[PDB]
Amino acid sequence: DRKIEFSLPDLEGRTHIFKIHARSMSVERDIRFELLARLCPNSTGAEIRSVCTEAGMFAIRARRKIATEKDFLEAVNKVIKSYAKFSATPRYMTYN
Amino acid sequence: NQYDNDVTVWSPQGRIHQIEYAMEAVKQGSATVGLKSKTHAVLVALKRAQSELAAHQKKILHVDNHIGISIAGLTADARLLCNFMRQECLDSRFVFDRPLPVSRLVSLIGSKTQIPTQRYGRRPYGVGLLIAGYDDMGPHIFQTCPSANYFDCRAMSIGARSQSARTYLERHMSEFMECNLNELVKHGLRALRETLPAEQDLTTKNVSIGIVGKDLEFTIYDDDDVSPFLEGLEERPQ
């Protein structure tokens, strides 16, 4: 009977997912997530979580306890745009 | 499925889902109602906009002095068939020096639109053209479809949520071949007020009314001049 679709979030569900996976990690205080959500037009929540969990590993790279906005930008181009060969989505948007 | 890819391919039941999907885009458009009196033809269109600063999208198009249409679907194929339509008027006006018959025209439109509904890699035209025109037989209200099966009628409606307006027209259609322009226009407005959400109806920027008359050229009326027609209507009962 019920036929629930799970699409991608428009902008604000994505921002909320950033607030989900990014609430429990040592961050710079004055970063914004809306800029990050503007850089992910088509992205799943697992991808957002991988951006967060990689973005902390950038802070673990040199010698930093809390990540920065440019660490997030180092996560976006690698997870989004450097793994963009695979991306797993586009022949599943049409479900084929 | 596999029977849902090309226009040429038949279903095992024999129902082409490409044309059946072309029937959806006219169901996505907004509402408009065409009808006629004994000597006058009136169609009323419900405009839409996207933002409040964005203007409302017109639908009524003046083709000839006695021919006016209204659209439902995509504006690109609407103008594509519209320029063809004006062309098919002015050419025979250039040949025979006479107005062209409406029934003769719409047959040419269906023959025009039937062709890409048969070839390979060729879409149908998704449009819901309502046609008010004059032959020497007075008013004529025709409707189109993406299946190129045009229908003569006396009052119809297309777009999203037109069935309630049809139920309004069925229990008032006996009045329409006697009443003149003044109450006839607001009869059409009473068709449009049915198919709306229960809080906004006629806010003088989202509506246009075209009329052709037995001694009157087809005129499109938009909001300002709609205000003498839009007044004098009852409040919505609930």
Binding site: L39, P41 | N5, A49, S51, A55, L74, A76, R79
Partner: protein, 228 residues
């Protein structure tokens, strides 16, 4: 697996033109505002490299002395449409010794917008704001990858488009002026952009009933920045 290029959706619309609606969401944001004093227009550049020359790229380009344009989404395909607009205006002036109006430009481009097929290939990935001053005063239009166009008063198109429209409807009214429309635009741009605002990240152009189309440069522009 691979359908045709002219295949309708099960919902009815299409696939590929709807994909081009997604494709214009990645371009830089752009804002044009129709004010009765005149139409102002602004865009960022999305400056990437320090070695990059900034003025090589742009989004403002005029068609006539009363018509400017603004592009978004893909870039290289837009210049073809710019050429068609320029040539078409020279047709209308060549044949009627007058100016083609802005809406009549916009429908002429929009007729060209959906003409691909498999005879005689793909739709276009741009988004266009059209500024002009006709006999009806200021005019501002916006067209679609589906070829649908509309008149707007203040339109924000880009990746920050839906957030900038919300911040834009609350600040726009019917009785604005041009100088406050410029600074009001640069406030919203200052909010939505990433890099620090200077005289090089962004550029402007306005059109007036009095004078022609004018484009701002890095001399008369930073006074609004220091006076934001």
């Amino acid at each position: 697996y691979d359908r045709g290029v002219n295949t309708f959706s099960p919902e009815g619309r299409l696939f590929q033109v709807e994909y081009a609606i997604e494709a214009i969401k990645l371009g830089s944001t752009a804002i044009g505002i129709q004010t009765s004093e005149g139409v102002c227009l602004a865009v960022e550049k999305r400056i990437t490299s320090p070695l990059m020359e900034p003025s090589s790229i742009e989004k403002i380009v005029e068609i006539d002395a009363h018509i400017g344009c603004a592009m978004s989404g893909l870039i290289a395909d837009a210049k073809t449409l710019i050429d068609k607009a320029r040539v078409e205006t020279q047709n209308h002036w060549f044949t009627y010794n007058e100016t083609m109006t802005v809406e009549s430009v916009t429908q002429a481009v929009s007729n060209l917008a959906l003409q691909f097929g498999e005879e005689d290939s793909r739709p276009f990935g741009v988004a266009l704001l059209f500024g002009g001053v006709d006999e009806k005063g200021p005019q501002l239009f916006h067209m679609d990858p589906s070829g649908t166009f509309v008149q707007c008063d203040a339109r924000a198109i880009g990746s920050a488009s839906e957030g900038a429209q919300s911040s834009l409807q609350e600040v726009y009214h019917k009785s604005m002026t041009l100088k406050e429309a410029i600074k009001s635009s640069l406030i919203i741009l200052k909010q939505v952009m990433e890099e620090k605002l200077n005289a090089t990240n962004i550029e402007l152009a306005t059109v007036q009933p009095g004078q022609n189309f004018h484009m701002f440069t890095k001399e008369e522009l930073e006074e609004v920045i220091k006076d934001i």
